[PDB]
Design an enzyme around this catalytic site. Sequence first.
Site, PDB file in Angstrom:
ATOM      1  N   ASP A 165       0.549  -1.174   0.207  1.00 36.64           N
ATOM      2  CA  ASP A 165      -0.538  -0.053  -0.245  1.00 36.64           C
ATOM      3  C   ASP A 165       0.603   1.054  -0.030  1.00 36.64           C
ATOM      4  OD1 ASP A 165      -2.188   2.051   0.414  1.00 36.64           O
ATOM      5  OD2 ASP A 165      -2.570   1.809   2.191  1.00 36.64           O
ATOM      6  N   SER A 212      -0.748  15.800 -11.654  1.00 39.95           N
ATOM      7  CA  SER A 212      -0.875  15.465 -12.996  1.00 39.95           C
ATOM      8  C   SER A 212      -0.744  16.408 -14.277  1.00 39.95           C
ATOM      9  CB  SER A 212      -2.111  14.466 -13.583  1.00 39.95           C
ATOM     10  OG  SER A 212      -2.110  13.989 -14.824  1.00 39.95           O
TER      11      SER A 212
END
Length: 330
Positions: free
Chosen positions: A35, A199
């Site tokens: 994770d 992004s």
Amino acid sequence: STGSATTTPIDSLDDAYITPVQIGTPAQTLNLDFDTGSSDLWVFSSETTASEVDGQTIYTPSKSTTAKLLSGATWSISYGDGSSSSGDVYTDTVSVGGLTVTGQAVESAKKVSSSFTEDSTIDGLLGLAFSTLNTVSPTQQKTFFDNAKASLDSPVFTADLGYHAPGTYNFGFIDTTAYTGSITYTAVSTKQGFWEWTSTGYAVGSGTFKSTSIDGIADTGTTLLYLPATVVSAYWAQVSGAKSSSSVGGYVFPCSATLPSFTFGVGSARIVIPGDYIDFGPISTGSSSCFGGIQSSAGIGINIFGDVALKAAFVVFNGATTPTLGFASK
């Protein structure tokens, strides 16, 4: 040193991935959910409330000659999906794919919430976010990657998740045969303890690319792709009959649909998520309504590049003094 381990979907939808981890002497092998959005290595154990164990493999520290109780230490975590666990702490030898850390904090669960009990395939979590999020008290502990870093050939790990298929976690090296083209690297903020990046935009299907900054986290522990409501609405508007359902808890779409791809930007580069990766199947057995793999982050507080996005790429988690992330197509 390096390590290399295969990671395997727990079910036919890729709801999560499990990677075998050796703990203790002699080894006790448990299947952990790696994770990158949390920083605790915790396991089902001989100490877990018996009613809360239902098919998981347990770590028994009394059977490990290298296990030592970390006197006084406790841990307690709550995850973004409402699940939680807590317990005490041992140090022990932990190996992943041939890479060994001695003295790793292994957080032994005394209590787990129902969602963990109900998932018999996941024996615990191995956190790969930054050690500043580790919950051990009163002495915070380092992640497996932090402990291993100095011994690694290069201070990196890579995630190469498969679509409906196994993939690979590598520690200490970048497998240049595992991706196509070049790896594009992008800046990371560690201020929230996550692998947080920006992004450069998105496209829906064959549509034109929209240049817009989307701050989010690269999180292997989250199944889906969670993005701003504007972006998610633009995506689902291209699927006839798709709608947001408050009763189901997100966007659903007719199972008869062919989904468009979704592209996200990494600097000047582009990662294309094929439409099929966004299909999470019937909302209930036999239903013709299917759950979408791109969902709104509006109720979270953060955008999450989860498995839906990451499995479309070869991803480098670069833990150099100034961390960065790398993405390549594959």
